[PDB]
Coordinates of C-alpha atoms and ligand atoms in Angstrom, one line a residue:
Chain R
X1 CA 23.9 -43.0 -138.5
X2 CA 24.9 -46.4 -137.0
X3 CA 28.1 -48.3 -136.2
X4 CA 28.5 -52.1 -136.6
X5 CA 31.2 -53.9 -134.5
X6 CA 32.5 -57.3 -135.0
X7 CA 33.6 -58.7 -131.5
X8 CA 36.0 -61.6 -131.4
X9 CA 34.7 -64.1 -128.8
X10 CA 37.4 -66.8 -129.4
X11 CA 37.8 -70.0 -131.3
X12 CA 36.2 -73.5 -131.2
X13 CA 37.4 -76.8 -132.7
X14 CA 35.2 -79.7 -134.0
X15 CA 35.1 -82.7 -136.4
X16 CA 35.1 -81.2 -139.9
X17 CA 32.1 -83.7 -140.6
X18 CA 30.2 -81.6 -138.2
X19 CA 30.8 -78.5 -140.4
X20 CA 30.8 -80.4 -143.9
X21 CA 28.9 -83.7 -143.8
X22 CA 30.8 -86.6 -145.2
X23 CA 33.6 -84.3 -146.3
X24 CA 36.1 -87.1 -146.9
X25 CA 34.3 -90.6 -147.4
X26 CA 36.2 -93.9 -146.7
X27 CA 37.1 -95.8 -150.0
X28 CA 38.5 -99.2 -150.8
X29 CA 41.9 -97.5 -150.8
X30 CA 41.2 -95.6 -147.7
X31 CA 38.8 -97.8 -145.6
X32 CA 39.8 -96.1 -142.3
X33 CA 39.5 -92.4 -143.7
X34 CA 40.4 -89.9 -141.1
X35 CA 38.7 -86.7 -140.3
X36 CA 40.2 -83.3 -139.1
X37 CA 39.7 -81.3 -135.9
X38 CA 39.2 -77.9 -137.4
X39 CA 39.1 -74.5 -135.7
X40 CA 36.7 -71.8 -136.4
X41 CA 35.8 -68.4 -134.9
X42 CA 33.0 -67.4 -132.5
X43 CA 31.9 -63.8 -132.9
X44 CA 29.0 -61.5 -132.0
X45 CA 27.9 -58.1 -133.8
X46 CA 26.9 -55.0 -132.1
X47 CA 24.9 -52.6 -134.0
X48 CA 25.2 -49.2 -132.1
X49 CA 22.0 -47.7 -133.5
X50 CA 20.5 -44.4 -132.4
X51 CA 17.2 -46.2 -131.9
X52 CA 19.1 -48.5 -129.5
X53 CA 21.9 -51.0 -129.3
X54 CA 21.1 -54.4 -130.9
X55 CA 23.4 -57.4 -130.3
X56 CA 23.5 -60.4 -132.6
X57 CA 24.4 -63.6 -130.8
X58 CA 26.2 -63.7 -127.4
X59 CA 29.0 -66.4 -127.8
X60 CA 29.9 -68.8 -125.1
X61 CA 29.4 -68.3 -121.3
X62 CA 32.7 -67.7 -119.5
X63 CA 32.1 -70.6 -117.3
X64 CA 31.6 -73.1 -120.3
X65 CA 35.0 -74.9 -120.1
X66 CA 37.1 -76.7 -117.4
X67 CA 36.2 -79.1 -114.5
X68 CA 33.8 -76.7 -113.0
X69 CA 32.5 -75.9 -116.5
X70 CA 28.9 -75.7 -117.2
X71 CA 29.5 -77.7 -120.5
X72 CA 29.4 -81.5 -120.0
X73 CA 32.9 -83.0 -120.4
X74 CA 31.8 -84.8 -123.5
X75 CA 30.8 -81.5 -125.0
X76 CA 34.0 -79.9 -123.9
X77 CA 35.9 -82.5 -125.6
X78 CA 34.0 -82.5 -128.9
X79 CA 33.6 -78.8 -129.2
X80 CA 36.3 -77.2 -127.2
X81 CA 36.3 -73.4 -126.8
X82 CA 39.5 -71.4 -126.4
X83 CA 39.1 -67.8 -125.3
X84 CA 41.3 -65.2 -123.4
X85 CA 39.6 -63.0 -121.0
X86 CA 39.6 -60.3 -123.6
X87 CA 37.7 -62.5 -125.9
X88 CA 34.7 -62.7 -123.3
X89 CA 31.6 -60.6 -124.6
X90 CA 31.4 -58.7 -121.4
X91 CA 35.0 -57.4 -121.8
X92 CA 34.6 -57.0 -125.5
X93 CA 31.6 -54.6 -124.7
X94 CA 33.4 -52.9 -121.9
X95 CA 36.2 -52.1 -124.3
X96 CA 33.5 -50.3 -126.3
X97 CA 32.1 -48.6 -123.1
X98 CA 29.0 -50.7 -123.6
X99 CA 27.3 -52.2 -120.5
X100 CA 24.8 -55.2 -120.9
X101 CA 22.1 -52.8 -119.4
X102 CA 22.6 -50.6 -122.7
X103 CA 21.4 -53.4 -124.8
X104 CA 17.8 -52.8 -126.1
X105 CA 17.6 -56.0 -128.2
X106 CA 19.5 -59.3 -128.4
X107 CA 19.0 -61.5 -131.5
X108 CA 19.5 -65.1 -130.8
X109 CA 20.3 -66.7 -134.2
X110 CA 19.6 -69.9 -132.4
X111 CA 20.1 -71.3 -128.8
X112 CA 23.2 -73.4 -129.4
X113 CA 25.9 -73.2 -126.7
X114 CA 28.1 -71.0 -128.8
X115 CA 25.5 -68.4 -129.6
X116 CA 23.3 -68.1 -126.6
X117 CA 26.1 -68.5 -124.0
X118 CA 25.7 -65.0 -122.5
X119 CA 22.0 -64.3 -123.0
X120 CA 21.8 -64.2 -119.2
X121 CA 23.7 -60.9 -119.1
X122 CA 21.0 -58.9 -121.0
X123 CA 18.4 -58.4 -118.4
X124 CA 17.2 -55.1 -119.6
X125 CA 16.8 -56.2 -123.2
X126 CA 14.2 -57.9 -125.3
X127 CA 15.6 -61.3 -126.5
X128 CA 14.3 -62.2 -129.9
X129 CA 14.4 -65.8 -130.7
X130 CA 12.6 -68.4 -132.9
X131 CA 9.7 -69.8 -131.1
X132 CA 10.6 -73.4 -132.3
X133 CA 14.1 -72.8 -131.1
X134 CA 12.9 -71.6 -127.7
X135 CA 10.4 -74.5 -127.3
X136 CA 13.2 -77.0 -128.4
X137 CA 15.6 -75.8 -125.8
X138 CA 13.0 -75.5 -123.1
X139 CA 12.3 -79.3 -123.7
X140 CA 16.1 -80.0 -123.3
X141 CA 15.8 -78.2 -120.1
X142 CA 12.7 -79.9 -118.8
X143 CA 13.8 -83.4 -119.7
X144 CA 17.0 -82.5 -117.8
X145 CA 19.0 -83.3 -120.9
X146 CA 22.8 -82.5 -119.9
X147 CA 24.8 -83.4 -123.0
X148 CA 24.3 -81.8 -126.4
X149 CA 24.4 -78.3 -127.8
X150 CA 21.8 -76.9 -125.4
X151 CA 23.5 -76.2 -122.2
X152 CA 21.1 -76.8 -119.3
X153 CA 23.0 -74.5 -116.9
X154 CA 22.8 -71.8 -119.4
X155 CA 19.0 -72.0 -119.8
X156 CA 18.6 -72.4 -116.0
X157 CA 20.4 -69.0 -115.8
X158 CA 18.0 -67.4 -118.5
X159 CA 15.1 -68.3 -116.4
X160 CA 16.5 -67.4 -113.0
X161 CA 17.6 -64.0 -114.5
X162 CA 14.1 -63.4 -115.7
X163 CA 14.9 -62.6 -119.3
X164 CA 12.4 -60.8 -121.3
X165 CA 11.6 -63.0 -124.4
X166 CA 10.0 -62.0 -127.9
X167 CA 9.5 -65.2 -129.8
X168 CA 9.3 -65.0 -133.7
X169 CA 6.3 -67.2 -134.8
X170 CA 6.9 -70.0 -137.4
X171 CA 5.1 -68.1 -140.1
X172 CA 5.9 -64.5 -138.8
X173 CA 7.2 -62.0 -141.3
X174 CA 10.7 -60.4 -141.0
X175 CA 10.7 -58.0 -138.1
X176 CA 11.9 -54.4 -138.6
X177 CA 13.8 -53.8 -135.3
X178 CA 15.1 -50.5 -136.5
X179 CA 16.0 -48.4 -139.5
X180 CA 17.9 -50.7 -141.9
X181 CA 17.9 -53.5 -139.4
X182 CA 15.5 -56.5 -140.1
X183 CA 15.2 -59.7 -138.4
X184 CA 15.1 -62.5 -141.0
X185 CA 13.1 -65.5 -140.1
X186 CA 15.0 -68.5 -141.6
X187 CA 13.1 -71.1 -139.8
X188 CA 14.0 -74.6 -139.5
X189 CA 17.4 -76.0 -140.8
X190 CA 20.7 -76.2 -138.9
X191 CA 18.5 -76.0 -135.8
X192 CA 14.8 -75.8 -134.9
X193 CA 14.4 -72.1 -135.5
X194 CA 17.0 -69.9 -137.2
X195 CA 17.1 -66.2 -137.1
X196 CA 19.2 -63.9 -139.3
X197 CA 19.8 -60.1 -139.6
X198 CA 19.7 -57.9 -142.6
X199 CA 21.6 -54.6 -141.9
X200 CA 21.5 -51.7 -144.3
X201 CA 24.4 -49.4 -143.5
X202 CA 24.7 -46.0 -145.2
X203 CA 28.4 -46.5 -146.2
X204 CA 29.2 -50.2 -146.1
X205 CA 25.9 -51.2 -147.7
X206 CA 23.8 -54.4 -147.1
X207 CA 25.0 -57.1 -144.7
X208 CA 23.4 -60.5 -144.1
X209 CA 24.3 -62.1 -140.8
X210 CA 23.4 -65.8 -141.6
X211 CA 25.0 -67.3 -138.4
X212 CA 24.8 -71.1 -138.5
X213 CA 22.3 -71.1 -141.5
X214 CA 25.7 -71.0 -143.4
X215 CA 28.9 -72.2 -141.6
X216 CA 31.3 -71.3 -144.3
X217 CA 31.9 -70.3 -147.8
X218 CA 32.4 -73.9 -148.5
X219 CA 29.0 -74.5 -147.1
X220 CA 27.6 -71.8 -149.3
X221 CA 29.2 -72.9 -152.7
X222 CA 27.6 -73.3 -155.1
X223 CA 27.0 -76.1 -154.7
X224 CA 25.6 -76.4 -151.3
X225 CA 27.6 -78.7 -148.9
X226 CA 25.5 -79.4 -146.0
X227 CA 26.6 -79.7 -142.3
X228 CA 26.4 -82.8 -140.0
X229 CA 24.8 -80.6 -137.3
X230 CA 21.4 -80.4 -139.1
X231 CA 17.7 -80.7 -137.8
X232 CA 15.8 -80.0 -141.0
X233 CA 17.9 -81.0 -144.1
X234 CA 15.3 -79.5 -146.5
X235 CA 14.8 -76.3 -144.5
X236 CA 18.4 -75.8 -144.5
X237 CA 18.9 -76.2 -148.1
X238 CA 16.0 -73.7 -148.8
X239 CA 17.4 -71.2 -146.3
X240 CA 20.8 -71.1 -148.1
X241 CA 19.1 -70.5 -151.5
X242 CA 16.9 -67.9 -149.8
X243 CA 19.9 -66.1 -148.5
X244 CA 21.5 -66.2 -151.8
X245 CA 18.6 -64.8 -153.5
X246 CA 18.3 -62.0 -150.9
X247 CA 22.0 -61.2 -151.2
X248 CA 21.8 -60.9 -155.1
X249 CA 18.6 -58.7 -154.9
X250 CA 19.8 -56.5 -152.1
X251 CA 23.5 -56.4 -153.3
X252 CA 24.3 -57.5 -149.7
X253 CA 27.4 -59.2 -148.2
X254 CA 26.9 -62.6 -146.5
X255 CA 28.5 -63.1 -143.2
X256 CA 28.9 -66.8 -142.3
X257 CA 28.6 -68.1 -138.8
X258 CA 32.1 -69.7 -138.6
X259 CA 34.4 -69.0 -141.5
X260 CA 38.0 -68.4 -140.4
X261 CA 39.0 -66.8 -143.6
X262 CA 36.1 -64.2 -143.7
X263 CA 36.7 -63.5 -140.1
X264 CA 40.3 -62.8 -140.5
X265 CA 39.2 -60.2 -143.1
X266 CA 36.7 -58.6 -140.8
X267 CA 37.4 -55.4 -139.0
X268 CA 37.0 -56.2 -135.4
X269 CA 36.2 -54.0 -132.5
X270 CA 39.9 -53.6 -131.6
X271 CA 40.4 -51.7 -134.9
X272 CA 37.0 -50.2 -135.5
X273 CA 33.6 -50.6 -137.0
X274 CA 31.3 -50.6 -140.1
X275 CA 29.2 -47.4 -140.9
Chain U
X1 CA -1.5 -119.3 -149.7
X2 CA 1.7 -117.4 -150.5
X3 CA 5.4 -118.0 -150.2
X4 CA 7.9 -115.2 -149.5
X5 CA 11.5 -115.8 -150.6
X6 CA 14.6 -113.7 -149.4
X7 CA 17.2 -113.7 -152.2
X8 CA 20.9 -113.0 -151.4
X9 CA 22.0 -110.5 -154.1
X10 CA 25.5 -109.9 -152.6
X11 CA 27.3 -107.6 -150.2
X12 CA 28.4 -103.9 -150.3
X13 CA 30.9 -102.0 -148.3
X14 CA 30.8 -98.3 -147.5
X15 CA 31.9 -95.7 -144.8
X16 CA 30.0 -96.4 -141.5
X17 CA 29.2 -92.6 -141.5
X18 CA 26.9 -93.2 -144.5
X19 CA 24.9 -95.7 -142.4
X20 CA 25.2 -93.9 -139.1
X21 CA 25.9 -90.2 -139.6
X22 CA 28.5 -88.9 -137.1
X23 CA 29.0 -92.4 -135.6
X24 CA 32.5 -91.7 -134.1
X25 CA 33.2 -88.0 -133.8
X26 CA 36.7 -86.5 -133.5
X27 CA 37.8 -85.3 -129.9
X28 CA 40.5 -83.2 -128.4
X29 CA 42.3 -86.6 -127.7
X30 CA 41.2 -88.3 -131.1
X31 CA 41.6 -85.3 -133.6
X32 CA 41.8 -87.5 -136.6
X33 CA 39.2 -90.0 -135.6
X34 CA 38.9 -92.8 -138.1
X35 CA 35.9 -94.3 -139.7
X36 CA 35.2 -97.9 -140.6
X37 CA 34.3 -99.5 -144.0
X38 CA 31.6 -101.8 -143.2
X39 CA 29.8 -104.8 -145.0
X40 CA 26.2 -104.9 -145.5
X41 CA 23.8 -107.3 -147.4
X42 CA 22.0 -106.5 -150.7
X43 CA 18.6 -108.5 -150.9
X44 CA 15.5 -108.8 -152.8
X45 CA 12.1 -110.3 -151.7
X46 CA 9.8 -112.4 -154.0
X47 CA 6.2 -112.9 -152.8
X48 CA 4.9 -115.9 -154.9
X49 CA 1.3 -114.9 -154.7
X50 CA -1.7 -116.8 -156.4
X51 CA -2.7 -113.3 -157.6
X52 CA 0.6 -112.9 -159.2
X53 CA 4.4 -112.7 -158.4
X54 CA 5.5 -109.5 -156.6
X55 CA 9.2 -108.6 -156.4
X56 CA 10.3 -106.1 -153.8
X57 CA 13.6 -104.3 -155.1
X58 CA 16.0 -105.7 -157.7
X59 CA 19.6 -105.3 -156.3
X60 CA 22.5 -104.3 -158.5
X61 CA 23.0 -104.7 -162.1
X62 CA 25.4 -107.6 -163.1
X63 CA 27.4 -105.1 -165.2
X64 CA 27.7 -102.6 -162.4
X65 CA 31.4 -103.1 -161.3
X66 CA 34.7 -103.3 -163.0
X67 CA 36.4 -101.4 -165.9
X68 CA 33.6 -101.7 -168.2
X69 CA 31.1 -101.3 -165.5
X70 CA 28.1 -98.9 -165.5
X71 CA 29.0 -97.5 -162.2
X72 CA 31.3 -94.5 -162.2
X73 CA 34.8 -95.4 -160.7
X74 CA 34.3 -93.1 -157.7
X75 CA 31.1 -94.9 -157.0
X76 CA 32.5 -98.3 -157.4
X77 CA 35.3 -97.2 -154.9
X78 CA 33.0 -95.7 -152.2
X79 CA 30.2 -98.4 -152.6
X80 CA 31.9 -101.6 -153.8
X81 CA 29.5 -104.5 -154.6
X82 CA 30.9 -108.0 -154.2
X83 CA 28.7 -110.8 -155.8
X84 CA 29.1 -114.2 -157.3
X85 CA 27.1 -115.2 -160.3
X86 CA 24.8 -117.1 -158.0
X87 CA 23.9 -113.9 -156.1
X88 CA 22.7 -112.2 -159.3
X89 CA 18.9 -111.8 -159.0
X90 CA 18.4 -113.4 -162.6
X91 CA 20.1 -116.5 -161.3
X92 CA 18.4 -116.5 -157.7
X93 CA 15.1 -116.3 -159.6
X94 CA 16.2 -119.1 -162.1
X95 CA 16.9 -121.3 -159.1
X96 CA 13.3 -120.8 -158.1
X97 CA 12.1 -121.6 -161.7
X98 CA 11.0 -118.0 -161.9
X99 CA 11.4 -116.1 -165.2
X100 CA 11.5 -112.3 -165.3
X101 CA 8.5 -112.5 -167.4
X102 CA 6.6 -114.1 -164.6
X103 CA 6.8 -111.0 -162.4
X104 CA 3.4 -109.0 -162.3
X105 CA 4.6 -106.4 -160.1
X106 CA 8.1 -104.9 -159.2
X107 CA 8.0 -102.4 -156.0
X108 CA 11.1 -100.2 -156.2
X109 CA 11.6 -99.0 -152.6
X110 CA 13.9 -96.2 -154.1
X111 CA 15.8 -96.0 -157.3
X112 CA 19.3 -96.0 -155.7
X113 CA 22.0 -98.1 -157.5
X114 CA 21.5 -101.1 -155.2
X115 CA 17.8 -101.5 -155.3
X116 CA 16.8 -100.6 -158.8
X117 CA 19.8 -102.4 -160.6
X118 CA 17.8 -104.9 -162.5
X119 CA 14.5 -103.1 -163.2
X120 CA 15.2 -103.4 -166.9
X121 CA 14.7 -107.3 -166.8
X122 CA 11.0 -106.9 -165.8
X123 CA 9.5 -105.8 -169.0
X124 CA 6.1 -107.6 -168.5
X125 CA 5.6 -106.2 -164.9
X126 CA 4.3 -103.1 -163.6
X127 CA 6.9 -101.0 -161.7
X128 CA 5.6 -99.3 -158.7
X129 CA 7.7 -96.4 -157.6
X130 CA 7.3 -93.1 -155.8
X131 CA 6.7 -90.4 -158.2
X132 CA 9.1 -88.0 -156.5
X133 CA 11.7 -90.7 -156.6
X134 CA 11.1 -91.3 -160.2
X135 CA 11.1 -87.7 -161.0
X136 CA 14.4 -87.1 -159.2
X137 CA 16.3 -90.0 -160.8
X138 CA 14.9 -88.8 -164.3
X139 CA 16.5 -85.4 -163.6
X140 CA 19.7 -87.1 -162.7
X141 CA 19.5 -88.6 -166.2
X142 CA 18.6 -85.4 -168.2
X143 CA 21.4 -83.5 -166.5
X144 CA 23.6 -86.3 -167.5
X145 CA 24.9 -86.9 -163.9
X146 CA 27.2 -89.8 -164.1
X147 CA 28.4 -89.9 -160.5
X148 CA 26.2 -90.6 -157.4
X149 CA 23.7 -93.2 -156.3
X150 CA 21.5 -92.8 -159.5
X151 CA 23.1 -94.9 -162.3
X152 CA 22.6 -93.1 -165.8
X153 CA 23.2 -96.3 -167.6
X154 CA 20.6 -98.3 -165.4
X155 CA 18.0 -95.4 -166.0
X156 CA 19.0 -95.4 -169.8
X157 CA 18.2 -99.1 -169.8
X158 CA 14.8 -98.6 -168.2
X159 CA 13.7 -96.3 -170.9
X160 CA 15.1 -98.4 -173.7
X161 CA 13.3 -101.4 -172.4
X162 CA 10.2 -99.6 -172.3
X163 CA 9.2 -100.5 -168.6
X164 CA 5.7 -99.9 -167.6
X165 CA 5.5 -97.6 -164.6
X166 CA 3.0 -96.9 -161.9
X167 CA 4.0 -93.9 -159.9
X168 CA 2.7 -93.6 -156.4
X169 CA 1.6 -89.9 -155.9
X170 CA 2.9 -87.9 -153.1
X171 CA -0.2 -87.9 -151.0
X172 CA -1.4 -91.4 -152.3
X173 CA -2.9 -93.8 -149.7
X174 CA -1.3 -97.4 -149.2
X175 CA -2.0 -99.5 -152.2
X176 CA -3.6 -102.9 -151.9
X177 CA -1.4 -104.7 -154.4
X178 CA -2.7 -108.2 -153.4
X179 CA -4.5 -110.0 -150.5
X180 CA -2.2 -109.3 -147.6
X181 CA 0.3 -107.2 -149.7
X182 CA 0.1 -103.5 -149.2
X183 CA 2.5 -100.9 -150.7
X184 CA 3.4 -98.4 -148.0
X185 CA 4.0 -94.9 -149.1
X186 CA 6.8 -93.6 -146.8
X187 CA 7.5 -90.6 -148.9
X188 CA 10.7 -88.6 -148.7
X189 CA 13.4 -89.3 -146.1
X190 CA 16.5 -91.5 -147.1
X191 CA 15.7 -90.5 -150.7
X192 CA 13.1 -88.4 -152.6
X193 CA 10.3 -91.1 -152.3
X194 CA 10.4 -94.3 -150.4
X195 CA 8.0 -97.2 -150.6
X196 CA 7.7 -100.1 -148.1
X197 CA 5.6 -103.3 -148.2
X198 CA 3.4 -104.7 -145.5
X199 CA 3.0 -108.4 -146.1
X200 CA 0.6 -110.4 -144.0
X201 CA 1.5 -114.1 -144.2
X202 CA -0.9 -116.9 -142.9
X203 CA 1.8 -118.6 -141.0
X204 CA 4.7 -116.2 -140.4
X205 CA 2.2 -113.2 -139.7
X206 CA 3.0 -109.5 -140.4
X207 CA 6.2 -108.3 -142.2
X208 CA 7.2 -104.7 -143.0
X209 CA 10.0 -104.4 -145.6
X210 CA 11.5 -101.0 -144.8
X211 CA 14.3 -101.1 -147.2
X212 CA 16.6 -98.1 -146.7
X213 CA 13.9 -96.2 -144.6
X214 CA 15.7 -98.1 -141.9
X215 CA 19.3 -99.2 -142.6
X216 CA 19.9 -101.4 -139.6
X217 CA 18.6 -102.2 -136.0
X218 CA 21.1 -99.5 -134.8
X219 CA 19.2 -97.0 -137.0
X220 CA 16.0 -98.1 -135.6
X221 CA 16.9 -97.8 -131.8
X222 CA 15.4 -96.3 -130.0
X223 CA 16.7 -93.9 -130.2
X224 CA 16.9 -93.2 -133.8
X225 CA 20.4 -92.9 -135.3
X226 CA 20.0 -91.3 -138.7
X227 CA 22.1 -92.0 -141.8
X228 CA 24.7 -89.7 -143.8
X229 CA 22.7 -90.7 -147.0
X230 CA 19.6 -88.6 -146.4
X231 CA 17.6 -86.1 -148.4
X232 CA 14.7 -85.3 -145.9
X233 CA 16.0 -85.5 -142.2
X234 CA 12.5 -84.9 -140.9
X235 CA 10.6 -87.1 -143.2
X236 CA 13.2 -89.8 -142.3
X237 CA 12.7 -89.4 -138.6
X238 CA 8.9 -89.4 -139.1
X239 CA 9.0 -92.6 -141.4
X240 CA 11.0 -94.6 -138.8
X241 CA 8.5 -93.8 -136.1
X242 CA 5.6 -94.5 -138.5
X243 CA 7.2 -98.0 -139.0
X244 CA 7.5 -98.5 -135.3
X245 CA 3.8 -97.8 -134.8
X246 CA 2.6 -100.0 -137.7
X247 CA 4.7 -102.8 -136.5
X248 CA 3.4 -102.4 -132.8
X249 CA -0.2 -102.2 -134.0
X250 CA 0.0 -105.0 -136.6
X251 CA 2.3 -107.1 -134.4
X252 CA 4.7 -107.2 -137.4
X253 CA 8.4 -107.9 -137.9
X254 CA 10.4 -105.0 -139.4
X255 CA 12.9 -106.2 -142.1
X256 CA 15.8 -103.6 -142.3
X257 CA 17.4 -102.7 -145.7
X258 CA 21.1 -103.5 -145.0
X259 CA 21.4 -105.2 -141.5
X260 CA 24.1 -107.8 -141.6
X261 CA 22.9 -109.6 -138.4
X262 CA 19.3 -109.7 -139.2
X263 CA 20.0 -111.0 -142.7
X264 CA 22.2 -114.0 -141.3
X265 CA 19.1 -115.0 -139.4
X266 CA 16.9 -114.9 -142.5
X267 CA 15.9 -118.1 -144.3
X268 CA 17.2 -117.5 -147.8
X269 CA 15.9 -118.8 -151.1
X270 CA 18.5 -121.7 -151.1
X271 CA 17.0 -123.0 -147.8
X272 CA 13.4 -122.2 -148.3
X273 CA 10.6 -119.4 -147.7
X274 CA 8.1 -118.0 -145.5
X275 CA 4.4 -118.9 -145.6
Ligands
CO301 CO1 24.8 -73.9 -134.3
CO302 CO1 19.4 -96.3 -150.6
FE303 FE1 27.7 -72.1 -134.1
FE304 FE1 20.5 -99.4 -150.1

């Protein structure tokens, strides 16, 4: 029935402490302990479904980086994005003969700069987003916040391009978007409102797209190693355990948001898909 | 009526990222950004009240550090405590002609190693503690956790010395402990359950003892700069703002848990007291 594509939208580097909070604490013997600037993948997932094309996340906007970049300079320096034109989502989709207009549904895991970058392209889609995440980003916008993980120029484009939103309510149940495609309401954790996907593929089986609910296998453990980027510590911990339970009960794989190792092993859109 | 004493119970050093989460993030230009290893005061407060002597916090145990120390070696290395004999609470109290047996109430802000160290001394007192904090530490003990901020040997002593506990229930209102002395139920934040004191002194006026609900003036802001040592991020943020409001409405000073600058300006027990 359906085909699932992993599209490579480039790499980003940041302080490991953002990814694993307090990963290497200072000691009497190492009072000025150093961190690392680690690299991690940015990716999106296309589910080419007979009921319609579903896109999970949208990576970064092409005009994110550089002197004329939408991203503030501090942001560009703390979370630099490296991507070839081939890695841009529009191009990755073009290489699959998919036009933005062909996307029925976009699922925004959250509205961070490296997941909601290209929402603006999908003007014929219904954008599914957690209401608290939406609200939180709209406040960043309204208060003219220019630094941080919510890109003002990105949100501006969303509104100017008249996107069609479908917010997931705080206590809303999981949404069946299509046969074998369920939107999981993880709620507050890494961000204000986290959404995930459960995909049931005829051949591959079950897949949980966790996005930044779980950064990496190191995050996942056990035991859980929480991130530095976190809004609701408790919601985060609960979400990870919930994902772990869903995986074991549905015998599903868990695809982390930003795990280099796991990504290396993924079959990307230049080699094929998952059925 | 009452006399309030600030007792210097030593100094401790740790990674600044514990105090201020992500205080100096790595950048493209500083990929191996360094943390610092900062010094901060450990103190306790004695309210010599006509209704009875109230102690807020108990510092670290004398036998905490060194090869035969109660603290695990990793803990002694990440959170080293420096203290001369005079800084020990038993001695600080002795210099005020105060015997452990003279304490009617001990208020444990939380049960971290540097606040609950000497609970065992107060065998004739009622130990007031948040129930969630108590529960959390009793689990650390039962699971024989020997690393971390909850010292197994400390907890072992509490049970052996048959301390008399009074737990503050999760949704319990503030407790009037004595005229002008209220226990503030902050709940989860820095740790599982945090208690503060509001003291109304005839001369000095209102004082909020925040303990680790607010590490420092930098934590307090505004804006709030949360710590790396945190269980409930949201509860933490709520608590700080609650303190700000109480302070404003009660025209009260806020005494932070571990603020080097503020502590220097405090009149300690070797110079006098607050009335
Ligand atoms: Co994110
Ligand atoms: Co503490
Ligand atoms: Fe991300
Ligand atoms: Fe402390």
